[PDB]
PDB file of C-alpha atoms and ligand atoms in Angstrom:
ATOM      1  CA  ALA Z   1    -199.302 146.379 -71.871  1.00 38.01           C
ATOM      2  CA  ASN Z   2    -198.515 146.021 -68.158  1.00 36.94           C
ATOM      3  CA  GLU Z   3    -199.720 142.568 -67.576  1.00 38.16           C
ATOM      4  CA  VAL Z   4    -198.920 138.877 -66.910  1.00 39.17           C
ATOM      5  CA  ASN Z   5    -200.737 135.833 -68.230  1.00 38.12           C
ATOM      6  CA  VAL Z   6    -201.400 133.136 -65.609  1.00 37.30           C
ATOM      7  CA  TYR Z   7    -202.423 129.652 -66.436  1.00 37.21           C
ATOM      8  CA  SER Z   8    -203.549 128.260 -63.098  1.00 38.12           C
ATOM      9  CA  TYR Z   9    -204.299 124.677 -61.787  1.00 38.39           C
ATOM     10  CA  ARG Z  10    -205.059 126.332 -58.504  1.00 40.13           C
ATOM     11  CA  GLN Z  11    -208.699 126.900 -57.668  1.00 41.30           C
ATOM     12  CA  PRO Z  12    -209.792 130.505 -57.827  1.00 43.80           C
ATOM     13  CA  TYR Z  13    -210.699 130.757 -54.109  1.00 43.28           C
ATOM     14  CA  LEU Z  14    -207.293 129.669 -53.251  1.00 43.90           C
ATOM     15  CA  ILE Z  15    -205.133 131.933 -55.571  1.00 43.41           C
ATOM     16  CA  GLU Z  16    -207.138 135.027 -56.321  1.00 43.21           C
ATOM     17  CA  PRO Z  17    -206.596 136.752 -52.965  1.00 44.35           C
ATOM     18  CA  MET Z  18    -202.889 136.542 -53.670  1.00 47.01           C
ATOM     19  CA  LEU Z  19    -203.197 137.626 -57.265  1.00 48.21           C
ATOM     20  CA  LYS Z  20    -205.391 140.510 -56.307  1.00 47.22           C
ATOM     21  CA  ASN Z  21    -202.898 141.766 -53.757  1.00 45.93           C
ATOM     22  CA  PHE Z  22    -200.203 141.351 -56.340  1.00 44.30           C
ATOM     23  CA  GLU Z  23    -202.144 143.602 -58.789  1.00 45.81           C
ATOM     24  CA  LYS Z  24    -202.797 146.198 -56.025  1.00 43.03           C
ATOM     25  CA  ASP Z  25    -199.138 146.208 -54.903  1.00 42.73           C
ATOM     26  CA  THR Z  26    -197.493 146.095 -58.266  1.00 47.87           C
ATOM     27  CA  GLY Z  27    -199.919 147.655 -60.631  1.00 46.32           C
ATOM     28  CA  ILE Z  28    -199.357 144.692 -62.863  1.00 44.74           C
ATOM     29  CA  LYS Z  29    -202.619 143.412 -64.429  1.00 43.57           C
ATOM     30  CA  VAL Z  30    -203.245 139.601 -63.980  1.00 41.61           C
ATOM     31  CA  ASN Z  31    -204.943 137.748 -66.782  1.00 40.58           C
ATOM     32  CA  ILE Z  32    -205.643 134.345 -65.649  1.00 36.46           C
ATOM     33  CA  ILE Z  33    -207.164 131.045 -67.092  1.00 34.54           C
ATOM     34  CA  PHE Z  34    -208.200 128.169 -64.733  1.00 35.03           C
ATOM     35  CA  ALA Z  35    -208.236 124.524 -65.384  1.00 33.35           C
ATOM     36  CA  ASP Z  36    -208.068 121.264 -63.714  1.00 34.35           C
ATOM     37  CA  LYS Z  37    -206.490 119.621 -66.710  1.00 35.92           C
ATOM     38  CA  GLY Z  38    -204.951 120.389 -70.123  1.00 36.71           C
ATOM     39  CA  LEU Z  39    -202.806 123.407 -69.513  1.00 38.38           C
ATOM     40  CA  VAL Z  40    -199.596 121.733 -69.974  1.00 38.15           C
ATOM     41  CA  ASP Z  41    -200.739 120.439 -73.257  1.00 41.87           C
ATOM     42  CA  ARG Z  42    -201.978 123.731 -74.140  1.00 41.97           C
ATOM     43  CA  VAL Z  43    -198.672 125.520 -73.596  1.00 42.49           C
ATOM     44  CA  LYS Z  44    -197.094 122.864 -75.740  1.00 39.45           C
ATOM     45  CA  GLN Z  45    -199.395 123.073 -78.638  1.00 37.71           C
ATOM     46  CA  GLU Z  46    -199.350 126.889 -78.468  1.00 38.85           C
ATOM     47  CA  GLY Z  47    -195.466 126.635 -78.853  1.00 36.54           C
ATOM     48  CA  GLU Z  48    -193.534 129.899 -79.444  1.00 37.53           C
ATOM     49  CA  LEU Z  49    -196.762 131.832 -79.782  1.00 34.68           C
ATOM     50  CA  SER Z  50    -197.939 130.803 -76.417  1.00 35.49           C
ATOM     51  CA  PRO Z  51    -198.993 133.880 -74.384  1.00 33.85           C
ATOM     52  CA  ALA Z  52    -198.423 131.950 -71.015  1.00 33.77           C
ATOM     53  CA  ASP Z  53    -196.217 133.592 -68.537  1.00 34.40           C
ATOM     54  CA  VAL Z  54    -196.777 131.952 -65.394  1.00 35.29           C
ATOM     55  CA  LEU Z  55    -198.034 128.237 -64.747  1.00 36.12           C
ATOM     56  CA  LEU Z  56    -199.450 127.820 -61.178  1.00 33.55           C
ATOM     57  CA  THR Z  57    -199.413 124.232 -60.021  1.00 34.64           C
ATOM     58  CA  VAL Z  58    -200.954 122.269 -57.107  1.00 34.83           C
ATOM     59  CA  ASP Z  59    -198.545 119.328 -57.519  1.00 35.38           C
ATOM     60  CA  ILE Z  60    -194.795 118.519 -57.893  1.00 34.10           C
ATOM     61  CA  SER Z  61    -195.651 116.018 -60.714  1.00 31.26           C
ATOM     62  CA  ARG Z  62    -197.272 118.606 -62.802  1.00 31.88           C
ATOM     63  CA  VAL Z  63    -194.243 120.898 -62.277  1.00 31.11           C
ATOM     64  CA  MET Z  64    -192.086 118.150 -63.518  1.00 32.37           C
ATOM     65  CA  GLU Z  65    -194.080 117.466 -66.557  1.00 30.79           C
ATOM     66  CA  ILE Z  66    -193.939 121.009 -67.641  1.00 33.57           C
ATOM     67  CA  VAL Z  67    -190.135 121.191 -66.961  1.00 31.46           C
ATOM     68  CA  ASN Z  68    -189.441 117.849 -68.524  1.00 27.93           C
ATOM     69  CA  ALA Z  69    -191.192 118.799 -71.662  1.00 26.32           C
ATOM     70  CA  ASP Z  70    -188.916 122.001 -72.001  1.00 25.80           C
ATOM     71  CA  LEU Z  71    -191.709 124.323 -71.498  1.00 26.78           C
ATOM     72  CA  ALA Z  72    -190.127 126.271 -68.647  1.00 27.89           C
ATOM     73  CA  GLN Z  73    -187.088 128.605 -68.458  1.00 21.56           C
ATOM     74  CA  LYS Z  74    -184.390 128.995 -65.795  1.00 21.44           C
ATOM     75  CA  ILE Z  75    -185.069 132.125 -63.448  1.00 23.48           C
ATOM     76  CA  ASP Z  76    -182.082 133.398 -61.564  1.00 22.30           C
ATOM     77  CA  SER Z  77    -183.554 135.492 -58.876  1.00 20.49           C
ATOM     78  CA  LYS Z  78    -181.823 136.623 -55.606  1.00 24.17           C
ATOM     79  CA  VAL Z  79    -185.161 137.351 -54.173  1.00 24.03           C
ATOM     80  CA  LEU Z  80    -186.381 133.749 -55.028  1.00 25.03           C
ATOM     81  CA  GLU Z  81    -183.134 132.346 -53.735  1.00 26.02           C
ATOM     82  CA  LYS Z  82    -183.472 134.092 -50.262  1.00 26.90           C
ATOM     83  CA  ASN Z  83    -187.200 133.596 -49.892  1.00 28.32           C
ATOM     84  CA  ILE Z  84    -187.597 129.950 -50.989  1.00 28.00           C
ATOM     85  CA  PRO Z  85    -185.678 127.414 -49.269  1.00 30.06           C
ATOM     86  CA  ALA Z  86    -183.471 125.108 -51.503  1.00 31.03           C
ATOM     87  CA  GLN Z  87    -185.401 122.110 -50.813  1.00 28.28           C
ATOM     88  CA  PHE Z  88    -188.541 123.792 -52.215  1.00 27.36           C
ATOM     89  CA  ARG Z  89    -187.145 124.930 -55.492  1.00 26.27           C
ATOM     90  CA  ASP Z  90    -185.400 123.316 -58.572  1.00 25.95           C
ATOM     91  CA  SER Z  91    -181.753 123.198 -58.117  1.00 28.04           C
ATOM     92  CA  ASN Z  92    -181.557 124.015 -61.671  1.00 30.20           C
ATOM     93  CA  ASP Z  93    -183.934 127.077 -61.314  1.00 26.44           C
ATOM     94  CA  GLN Z  94    -186.875 125.936 -63.666  1.00 28.29           C
ATOM     95  CA  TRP Z  95    -189.512 125.614 -60.893  1.00 30.72           C
ATOM     96  CA  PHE Z  96    -190.374 127.072 -57.535  1.00 31.70           C
ATOM     97  CA  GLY Z  97    -192.415 125.896 -54.648  1.00 32.29           C
ATOM     98  CA  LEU Z  98    -194.714 128.473 -52.969  1.00 29.81           C
ATOM     99  CA  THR Z  99    -196.351 126.333 -50.443  1.00 28.62           C
ATOM    100  CA  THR Z 100    -196.349 122.946 -48.988  1.00 27.35           C
ATOM    101  CA  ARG Z 101    -199.421 120.759 -48.037  1.00 27.73           C
ATOM    102  CA  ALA Z 102    -199.970 117.505 -46.422  1.00 26.43           C
ATOM    103  CA  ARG Z 103    -202.235 114.738 -47.850  1.00 23.16           C
ATOM    104  CA  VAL Z 104    -203.787 113.566 -44.706  1.00 24.19           C
ATOM    105  CA  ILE Z 105    -206.425 111.257 -43.309  1.00 23.79           C
ATOM    106  CA  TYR Z 106    -209.639 112.548 -42.097  1.00 23.00           C
ATOM    107  CA  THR Z 107    -211.474 110.301 -39.616  1.00 20.29           C
ATOM    108  CA  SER Z 108    -214.965 110.567 -38.012  1.00 20.41           C
ATOM    109  CA  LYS Z 109    -214.767 112.247 -34.869  1.00 20.09           C
ATOM    110  CA  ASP Z 110    -217.790 110.146 -33.415  1.00 22.15           C
ATOM    111  CA  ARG Z 111    -216.991 106.895 -35.198  1.00 24.83           C
ATOM    112  CA  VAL Z 112    -213.189 106.485 -35.157  1.00 26.62           C
ATOM    113  CA  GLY Z 113    -211.718 109.323 -33.180  1.00 24.74           C
ATOM    114  CA  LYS Z 114    -207.934 110.002 -33.700  1.00 29.43           C
ATOM    115  CA  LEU Z 115    -205.650 107.507 -35.423  1.00 29.91           C
ATOM    116  CA  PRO Z 116    -203.185 105.773 -33.262  1.00 29.68           C
ATOM    117  CA  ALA Z 117    -199.533 106.506 -33.603  1.00 28.07           C
ATOM    118  CA  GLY Z 118    -198.139 104.455 -36.441  1.00 27.33           C
ATOM    119  CA  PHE Z 119    -201.139 104.599 -38.784  1.00 29.00           C
ATOM    120  CA  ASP Z 120    -200.153 104.756 -42.373  1.00 31.96           C
ATOM    121  CA  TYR Z 121    -201.937 105.102 -45.641  1.00 32.10           C
ATOM    122  CA  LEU Z 122    -201.308 101.389 -46.264  1.00 34.51           C
ATOM    123  CA  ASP Z 123    -203.577 100.580 -43.291  1.00 32.95           C
ATOM    124  CA  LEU Z 124    -206.674 102.077 -45.257  1.00 33.40           C
ATOM    125  CA  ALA Z 125    -206.547  98.920 -47.413  1.00 32.09           C
ATOM    126  CA  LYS Z 126    -206.938  96.595 -44.547  1.00 34.90           C
ATOM    127  CA  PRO Z 127    -210.242  94.580 -44.533  1.00 33.72           C
ATOM    128  CA  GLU Z 128    -211.370  95.935 -41.250  1.00 33.19           C
ATOM    129  CA  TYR Z 129    -212.138  99.307 -43.159  1.00 28.30           C
ATOM    130  CA  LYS Z 130    -214.369  97.787 -45.680  1.00 27.83           C
ATOM    131  CA  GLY Z 131    -217.143 100.164 -46.706  1.00 30.15           C
ATOM    132  CA  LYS Z 132    -215.622 102.878 -44.466  1.00 29.81           C
ATOM    133  CA  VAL Z 133    -213.244 104.946 -46.815  1.00 28.13           C
ATOM    134  CA  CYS Z 134    -214.000 107.719 -49.078  1.00 27.28           C
ATOM    135  CA  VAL Z 135    -211.495 108.953 -51.728  1.00 25.15           C
ATOM    136  CA  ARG Z 136    -211.965 111.192 -54.752  1.00 26.28           C
ATOM    137  CA  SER Z 137    -210.987 110.099 -58.082  1.00 23.25           C
ATOM    138  CA  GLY Z 138    -207.899 107.807 -57.954  1.00 25.91           C
ATOM    139  CA  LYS Z 139    -206.695 109.904 -61.098  1.00 26.85           C
ATOM    140  CA  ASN Z 140    -206.800 113.128 -59.223  1.00 25.16           C
ATOM    141  CA  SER Z 141    -203.214 114.386 -59.214  1.00 23.84           C
ATOM    142  CA  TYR Z 142    -203.078 114.713 -55.423  1.00 26.08           C
ATOM    143  CA  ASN Z 143    -203.880 111.057 -55.163  1.00 27.26           C
ATOM    144  CA  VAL Z 144    -201.573 110.103 -58.004  1.00 24.78           C
ATOM    145  CA  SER Z 145    -198.687 111.697 -56.529  1.00 23.63           C
ATOM    146  CA  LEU Z 146    -199.374 110.149 -52.989  1.00 28.26           C
ATOM    147  CA  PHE Z 147    -199.430 106.681 -54.865  1.00 29.75           C
ATOM    148  CA  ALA Z 148    -196.180 107.750 -56.620  1.00 32.31           C
ATOM    149  CA  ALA Z 149    -194.478 108.333 -53.395  1.00 31.44           C
ATOM    150  CA  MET Z 150    -195.788 104.972 -52.169  1.00 27.75           C
ATOM    151  CA  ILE Z 151    -194.150 103.276 -55.225  1.00 27.57           C
ATOM    152  CA  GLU Z 152    -190.869 104.826 -54.280  1.00 27.25           C
ATOM    153  CA  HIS Z 153    -191.358 103.521 -50.830  1.00 28.32           C
ATOM    154  CA  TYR Z 154    -192.853 100.070 -51.421  1.00 23.76           C
ATOM    155  CA  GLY Z 155    -192.532  99.269 -55.089  1.00 19.13           C
ATOM    156  CA  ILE Z 156    -195.162  98.860 -57.725  1.00 18.92           C
ATOM    157  CA  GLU Z 157    -196.359  95.542 -56.749  1.00 16.09           C
ATOM    158  CA  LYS Z 158    -197.285  96.423 -53.223  1.00 17.55           C
ATOM    159  CA  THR Z 159    -198.638  99.786 -54.296  1.00 19.39           C
ATOM    160  CA  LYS Z 160    -200.977  97.941 -56.820  1.00 18.51           C
ATOM    161  CA  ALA Z 161    -202.313  95.624 -53.980  1.00 22.56           C
ATOM    162  CA  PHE Z 162    -202.609  98.706 -51.850  1.00 21.52           C
ATOM    163  CA  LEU Z 163    -204.874 100.327 -54.563  1.00 20.34           C
ATOM    164  CA  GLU Z 164    -206.771  97.164 -54.881  1.00 18.97           C
ATOM    165  CA  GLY Z 165    -207.472  96.956 -51.001  1.00 19.10           C
ATOM    166  CA  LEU Z 166    -208.281 100.702 -51.066  1.00 17.12           C
ATOM    167  CA  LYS Z 167    -210.719 100.464 -53.827  1.00 15.77           C
ATOM    168  CA  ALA Z 168    -212.380  97.392 -52.246  1.00 15.93           C
ATOM    169  CA  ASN Z 169    -212.785  99.527 -48.954  1.00 14.52           C
ATOM    170  CA  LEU Z 170    -214.583 102.412 -50.725  1.00 15.11           C
ATOM    171  CA  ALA Z 171    -217.923 103.445 -49.474  1.00 16.46           C
ATOM    172  CA  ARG Z 172    -219.028 104.891 -52.726  1.00 14.84           C
ATOM    173  CA  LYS Z 173    -217.776 105.486 -56.293  1.00 13.07           C
ATOM    174  CA  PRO Z 174    -215.217 108.076 -56.057  1.00 14.52           C
ATOM    175  CA  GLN Z 175    -216.849 111.581 -56.532  1.00 12.12           C
ATOM    176  CA  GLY Z 176    -216.219 115.094 -55.450  1.00 10.69           C
ATOM    177  CA  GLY Z 177    -213.147 116.735 -54.130  1.00  9.90           C
ATOM    178  CA  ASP Z 178    -211.333 116.476 -50.955  1.00 10.19           C
ATOM    179  CA  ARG Z 179    -213.802 118.590 -49.123  1.00  6.30           C
ATOM    180  CA  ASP Z 180    -216.723 116.586 -50.244  1.00  6.55           C
ATOM    181  CA  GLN Z 181    -215.190 113.446 -48.651  1.00  4.31           C
ATOM    182  CA  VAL Z 182    -215.254 115.291 -45.320  1.00  3.02           C
ATOM    183  CA  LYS Z 183    -219.014 115.992 -45.911  1.00  2.00           C
ATOM    184  CA  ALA Z 184    -219.400 112.421 -46.337  1.00  2.00           C
ATOM    185  CA  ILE Z 185    -217.737 111.707 -43.001  1.00  2.00           C
ATOM    186  CA  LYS Z 186    -220.024 114.242 -41.433  1.00  2.00           C
ATOM    187  CA  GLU Z 187    -223.080 112.570 -42.981  1.00  2.00           C
ATOM    188  CA  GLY Z 188    -221.980 109.090 -41.751  1.00  2.00           C
ATOM    189  CA  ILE Z 189    -221.358 107.765 -45.298  1.00  2.00           C
ATOM    190  CA  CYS Z 190    -217.496 106.917 -44.507  1.00  2.00           C
ATOM    191  CA  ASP Z 191    -215.291 107.019 -41.464  1.00  2.00           C
ATOM    192  CA  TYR Z 192    -212.016 107.659 -43.297  1.00  2.00           C
ATOM    193  CA  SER Z 193    -210.965 110.078 -46.130  1.00  2.09           C
ATOM    194  CA  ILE Z 194    -207.774 111.114 -47.783  1.00  2.00           C
ATOM    195  CA  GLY Z 195    -207.605 114.858 -48.459  1.00  2.00           C
ATOM    196  CA  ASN Z 196    -205.251 117.938 -48.335  1.00  2.00           C
ATOM    197  CA  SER Z 197    -204.702 119.474 -44.976  1.00  2.00           C
ATOM    198  CA  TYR Z 198    -205.431 123.058 -45.862  1.00  2.00           C
ATOM    199  CA  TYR Z 199    -209.131 122.135 -46.935  1.00  2.00           C
ATOM    200  CA  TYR Z 200    -209.710 121.480 -43.165  1.00  2.00           C
ATOM    201  CA  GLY Z 201    -208.934 125.012 -42.463  1.00  2.00           C
ATOM    202  CA  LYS Z 202    -210.887 126.346 -45.330  1.00  2.00           C
ATOM    203  CA  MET Z 203    -213.827 124.349 -44.084  1.00  2.00           C
ATOM    204  CA  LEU Z 204    -213.470 125.635 -40.668  1.00  2.00           C
ATOM    205  CA  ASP Z 205    -213.429 129.242 -42.077  1.00  2.00           C
ATOM    206  CA  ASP Z 206    -216.614 128.459 -44.258  1.00  2.00           C
ATOM    207  CA  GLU Z 207    -220.043 128.974 -42.415  1.00  2.00           C
ATOM    208  CA  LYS Z 208    -221.612 126.275 -44.581  1.00  2.00           C
ATOM    209  CA  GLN Z 209    -218.769 123.646 -44.275  1.00  2.00           C
ATOM    210  CA  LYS Z 210    -217.451 124.337 -40.643  1.00  2.00           C
ATOM    211  CA  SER Z 211    -219.858 121.568 -39.538  1.00  2.00           C
ATOM    212  CA  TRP Z 212    -218.104 119.091 -41.811  1.00  2.00           C
ATOM    213  CA  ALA Z 213    -214.773 119.729 -40.372  1.00  2.00           C
ATOM    214  CA  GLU Z 214    -216.100 119.617 -36.883  1.00  2.00           C
ATOM    215  CA  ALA Z 215    -217.364 116.142 -37.615  1.00  2.00           C
ATOM    216  CA  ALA Z 216    -214.026 115.050 -38.509  1.00  2.00           C
ATOM    217  CA  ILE Z 217    -210.378 114.890 -37.147  1.00  2.00           C
ATOM    218  CA  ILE Z 218    -207.326 115.735 -39.095  1.00  2.00           C
ATOM    219  CA  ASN Z 219    -204.633 112.841 -38.828  1.00  2.00           C
ATOM    220  CA  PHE Z 220    -201.098 112.996 -40.071  1.00  2.00           C
ATOM    221  CA  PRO Z 221    -199.959 109.434 -40.865  1.00  2.00           C
ATOM    222  CA  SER Z 222    -197.007 108.527 -38.711  1.00  2.00           C
ATOM    223  CA  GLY Z 223    -195.628 105.297 -40.189  1.00  2.00           C
ATOM    224  CA  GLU Z 224    -192.243 104.801 -41.337  1.00  2.00           C
ATOM    225  CA  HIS Z 225    -192.431 107.317 -43.987  1.00  2.00           C
ATOM    226  CA  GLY Z 226    -194.695 109.674 -42.146  1.00  2.00           C
ATOM    227  CA  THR Z 227    -197.025 112.191 -43.974  1.00  2.00           C
ATOM    228  CA  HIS Z 228    -197.024 112.846 -47.681  1.00  2.00           C
ATOM    229  CA  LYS Z 229    -195.992 116.361 -48.654  1.00  2.00           C
ATOM    230  CA  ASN Z 230    -196.564 118.157 -51.886  1.00  2.00           C
ATOM    231  CA  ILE Z 231    -196.322 121.786 -53.096  1.00  2.00           C
ATOM    232  CA  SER Z 232    -198.132 124.289 -54.844  1.00  2.00           C
ATOM    233  CA  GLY Z 233    -195.546 125.516 -57.410  1.00  2.00           C
ATOM    234  CA  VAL Z 234    -194.775 127.788 -60.203  1.00  2.00           C
ATOM    235  CA  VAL Z 235    -192.958 127.791 -63.535  1.00  2.00           C
ATOM    236  CA  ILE Z 236    -192.336 130.607 -65.964  1.00  2.00           C
ATOM    237  CA  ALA Z 237    -193.133 129.432 -69.528  1.00  2.00           C
ATOM    238  CA  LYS Z 238    -190.303 129.191 -71.957  1.00  2.00           C
ATOM    239  CA  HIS Z 239    -191.767 131.822 -74.218  1.00  2.00           C
ATOM    240  CA  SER Z 240    -193.146 134.101 -71.577  1.00  2.00           C
ATOM    241  CA  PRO Z 241    -194.154 137.307 -73.478  1.00  2.00           C
ATOM    242  CA  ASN Z 242    -194.196 139.329 -70.164  1.00  2.00           C
ATOM    243  CA  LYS Z 243    -191.208 137.774 -68.683  1.00  2.00           C
ATOM    244  CA  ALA Z 244    -190.192 140.687 -66.186  1.00  2.00           C
ATOM    245  CA  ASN Z 245    -193.681 140.957 -65.002  1.00  2.00           C
ATOM    246  CA  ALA Z 246    -193.738 137.031 -64.538  1.00  2.00           C
ATOM    247  CA  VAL Z 247    -190.709 137.175 -62.467  1.00  2.00           C
ATOM    248  CA  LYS Z 248    -192.200 139.969 -60.383  1.00  2.00           C
ATOM    249  CA  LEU Z 249    -195.191 137.791 -59.759  1.00  2.00           C
ATOM    250  CA  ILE Z 250    -193.353 134.862 -58.656  1.00  2.00           C
ATOM    251  CA  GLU Z 251    -190.992 136.906 -56.472  1.00  2.00           C
ATOM    252  CA  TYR Z 252    -194.124 138.451 -55.031  1.00  2.00           C
ATOM    253  CA  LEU Z 253    -195.716 135.175 -54.184  1.00  2.00           C
ATOM    254  CA  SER Z 254    -192.521 133.968 -52.457  1.00  2.00           C
ATOM    255  CA  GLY Z 255    -192.410 137.254 -50.319  1.00  2.00           C
ATOM    256  CA  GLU Z 256    -193.321 137.916 -46.675  1.00  2.00           C
ATOM    257  CA  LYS Z 257    -196.800 139.299 -47.501  1.00  2.00           C
ATOM    258  CA  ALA Z 258    -197.914 136.606 -49.926  1.00  2.00           C
ATOM    259  CA  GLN Z 259    -196.540 133.726 -47.897  1.00  2.00           C
ATOM    260  CA  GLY Z 260    -198.466 135.195 -44.964  1.00  2.00           C
ATOM    261  CA  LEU Z 261    -201.678 135.340 -47.115  1.00  2.00           C
ATOM    262  CA  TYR Z 262    -201.007 131.575 -48.168  1.00  2.00           C
ATOM    263  CA  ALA Z 263    -200.783 130.828 -44.506  1.00  2.00           C
ATOM    264  CA  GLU Z 264    -203.685 132.792 -43.189  1.00  2.00           C
ATOM    265  CA  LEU Z 265    -206.196 132.723 -46.071  1.00  2.00           C
ATOM    266  CA  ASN Z 266    -205.446 129.174 -47.354  1.00  2.00           C
ATOM    267  CA  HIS Z 267    -204.185 127.359 -44.208  1.00  2.00           C
ATOM    268  CA  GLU Z 268    -201.268 126.112 -46.151  1.00  2.00           C
ATOM    269  CA  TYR Z 269    -197.780 125.919 -45.029  1.00  2.00           C
ATOM    270  CA  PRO Z 270    -195.597 128.726 -46.231  1.00  2.00           C
ATOM    271  CA  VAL Z 271    -192.147 127.775 -47.668  1.00  2.00           C
ATOM    272  CA  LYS Z 272    -190.621 131.062 -46.550  1.00  2.00           C
ATOM    273  CA  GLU Z 273    -188.511 130.533 -43.203  1.00  2.00           C
ATOM    274  CA  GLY Z 274    -189.901 132.845 -40.572  1.00  2.00           C
ATOM    275  CA  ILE Z 275    -193.453 132.889 -41.791  1.00  2.00           C
ATOM    276  CA  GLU Z 276    -195.717 131.279 -39.052  1.00  2.00           C
ATOM    277  CA  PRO Z 277    -198.807 129.090 -39.982  1.00  2.00           C
ATOM    278  CA  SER Z 278    -202.293 130.165 -39.184  1.00  2.00           C
ATOM    279  CA  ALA Z 279    -203.647 129.540 -35.743  1.00  2.00           C
ATOM    280  CA  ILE Z 280    -205.673 126.796 -36.928  1.00  2.00           C
ATOM    281  CA  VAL Z 281    -202.785 125.205 -38.725  1.00  2.00           C
ATOM    282  CA  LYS Z 282    -200.643 125.762 -35.634  1.00  2.00           C
ATOM    283  CA  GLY Z 283    -203.202 123.973 -33.439  1.00  2.00           C
ATOM    284  CA  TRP Z 284    -202.882 120.796 -35.354  1.00  2.00           C
ATOM    285  CA  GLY Z 285    -199.508 120.299 -33.939  1.00  2.00           C
ATOM    286  CA  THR Z 286    -196.461 119.023 -35.798  1.00  2.00           C
ATOM    287  CA  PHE Z 287    -196.055 115.725 -37.638  1.00  2.00           C
ATOM    288  CA  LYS Z 288    -193.414 113.668 -39.314  1.00  2.00           C
ATOM    289  CA  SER Z 289    -193.008 114.733 -43.029  1.00  2.00           C
ATOM    290  CA  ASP Z 290    -191.893 112.200 -45.667  1.00  2.00           C
ATOM    291  CA  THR Z 291    -188.317 112.689 -46.449  1.00  2.00           C
ATOM    292  CA  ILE Z 292    -188.823 111.633 -50.060  1.00  2.00           C
ATOM    293  CA  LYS Z 293    -187.283 114.012 -52.500  1.00  2.00           C
ATOM    294  CA  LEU Z 294    -190.069 116.006 -54.447  1.00  2.00           C
ATOM    295  CA  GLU Z 295    -188.583 115.014 -57.792  1.00  2.00           C
ATOM    296  CA  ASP Z 296    -188.715 111.290 -56.776  1.00  2.00           C
ATOM    297  CA  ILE Z 297    -192.467 111.551 -56.250  1.00  2.00           C
ATOM    298  CA  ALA Z 298    -192.704 112.987 -59.732  1.00  2.00           C
ATOM    299  CA  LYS Z 299    -190.609 110.234 -61.096  1.00  2.00           C
ATOM    300  CA  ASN Z 300    -193.253 107.660 -60.136  1.00  2.00           C
ATOM    301  CA  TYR Z 301    -196.368 109.509 -61.305  1.00  2.00           C
ATOM    302  CA  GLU Z 302    -196.926 107.933 -64.587  1.00  2.00           C
ATOM    303  CA  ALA Z 303    -196.387 104.494 -63.213  1.00  2.00           C
ATOM    304  CA  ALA Z 304    -198.954 105.292 -60.321  1.00  2.00           C
ATOM    305  CA  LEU Z 305    -201.417 106.731 -62.862  1.00  2.00           C
ATOM    306  CA  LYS Z 306    -201.000 103.403 -64.732  1.00  2.00           C
ATOM    307  CA  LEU Z 307    -201.837 101.411 -61.534  1.00  2.00           C
ATOM    308  CA  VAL Z 308    -205.000 103.575 -60.966  1.00  2.00           C
ATOM    309  CA  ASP Z 309    -206.149 102.725 -64.455  1.00  2.00           C
ATOM    310  CA  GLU Z 310    -205.222  98.986 -64.033  1.00  2.00           C
ATOM    311  CA  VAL Z 311    -207.222  98.708 -60.893  1.00  2.00           C
ATOM    312  CA  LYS Z 312    -210.059 100.585 -62.324  1.00  2.00           C
ATOM    313  CA  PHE Z 313    -210.131 102.633 -59.091  1.00  2.00           C
ATOM    314  CA  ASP Z 314    -212.949 104.973 -60.095  1.00  2.00           C
ATOM    315  CA  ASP Z 315    -215.309 102.186 -61.375  1.00  2.00           C
ATOM    316  CA  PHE Z 316    -217.793 101.238 -58.579  1.00  2.00           C
TER     317      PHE Z 316
HETATM  318 FE1   FE E   1    -206.024 121.990 -53.661  1.00  2.00          FE
END
């Protein structure tokens, strides 16, 4: 066959455009399965008979789970070397970042306005925000990786206290995704949410959700450690049965065209130097990105997940 088998943690609407362009431009057929969980364990249990070629991630911690479990292989590509800056790929060539995203704080336009300079994630645990914060499941990987970064910066005790305070301030039982929290802001249920940056652009582009975005302000935390960054990523599976095609896919996704699609269609930040963000994303302005090393986020993921369970974050 002339195919590549993709296991995707990315949502269809945020990856199918790139994959369809890849199919058209290369002639390689994409077979894709989607999930929110269980794909790493699936590759592991499938073992040497796994058909997986490419694992698409939305989180550095998932990437490292795959790589640490010896489920990846090293890819030595001059195309990836050129297209992906070194800070967004494994020094040992087993994973590759394709975009970055910020986990931001959305606020009610009407009831909060823009956050002041210096506002940090930690501030969301302060008693003045009781009943005013919406967050999706604390066990969602975007949240766990944020909390993992917080462990690196503040330690486990202060991060646990933060999670207790954040939980205490929730306006409702964690439910829905990042966009749904912004709907809740629009409807007046909460005044603050945590969510990824690109969703704001997706909502603005959606006729049914632009009113949600219009009721909210995107804020990039500007405390000591700035705004949390994470990546969409990719690994080629250890036993990739269509490895040449897999390499062609990840090389394609790293290229000028696909990076432009990530920027323009997804409102993510491309990794490739020289590729501009969308007009919407540019309009948000710049911000201070956390300088934490991507691997040091992942290092703390399991501890962060344990904290989320300990504080029973999702139990209202
Ligand atoms: Fe996402």
